[PDB]
């Protein structure tokens, strides 16, 4: 049906451009939110993390 074809095309396009998407999202986060991309170790121990 139409639903299956649309989702198949979307999945193919999403998987084809996955890594470029991730790199661009990391670039946006790095240049807009913070330069410390520490999702896990940020909470393990509180240590100084400068933003220069």
């Amino acid at each position: 049906n139409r639903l299956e074809s649309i989702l198949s095309r979307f999945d193919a396009d999403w998987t084809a451009s996955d890594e470029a998407r991730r790199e661009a999202k990391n670039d946006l986060f790095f240049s807009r939110v913070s330069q410390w991309d520490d999702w896990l170790s940020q909470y393990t121990t509180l240590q100084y993390r400068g933003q220069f």
């Binding site: 913070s34 330069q35 410390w36 520490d38 940020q42 509180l46 100084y48 993390r49 400068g50 933003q51």
Partner: protein, 149 residues
């Protein structure tokens, strides 16, 4: 070995006084004096927990220390304790402990304080005027500067 009397008997055996390797027998007041010396030395080492901790149990004020009370030391601490006891009670019998006994006592004391020194080698927390950098997402919780120590 298992009680304070054993720590005294082994210490005397090391000095060559009152040991069955020389057919010499023991005096009860030698036991009493050496147990008192051991109690004093252990108390001086401990300093109410501010010094070396060896697991030694001190007799209460009501009951004076006796030969039969268990020392409570760890199995790795008995050697140092009785070697130092022998070193301390050597001048009692007009004798000087040999170089080997002194070296063994020093090595044993070093090994006793090794673990305590490792445990007490704890760094101080961050200062009270240190800022928590912008990389910490807890900064959003108004935690811009560190807690004081």
């Amino acid at each position: 070995i298992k009680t304070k009397g054993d720590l005294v008997r082994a210490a005397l055996r090391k000095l060559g006084v009152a040991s069955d390797a020389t057919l010499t027998d023991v005096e009860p007041q030698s036991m009493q004096d050496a147990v008192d010396d051991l109690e004093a030395m252990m108390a001086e080492w401990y300093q109410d927990g501010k010094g070396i901790i060896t697991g030694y149990v001190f007799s209460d004020d009501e009951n004076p220390p006796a030969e039969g009370d268990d020392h409570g030391l760890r199995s790795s601490a008995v050697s140092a304790v009785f070697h130092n006891l022998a070193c301390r009670i050597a001048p009692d019998y007009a004798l000087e402990a040999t170089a080997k006994i002194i070296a063994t006592a020093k090595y044993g004391k070093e090994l006793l304080y090794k673990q305590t020194a490792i445990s007490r080698a704890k760094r101080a927390p961050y200062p009270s005027r240190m800022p928590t950098g912008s990389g910490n997402s807890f900064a959003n919780l108004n935690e811009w500067h560190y807690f004081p120590g």
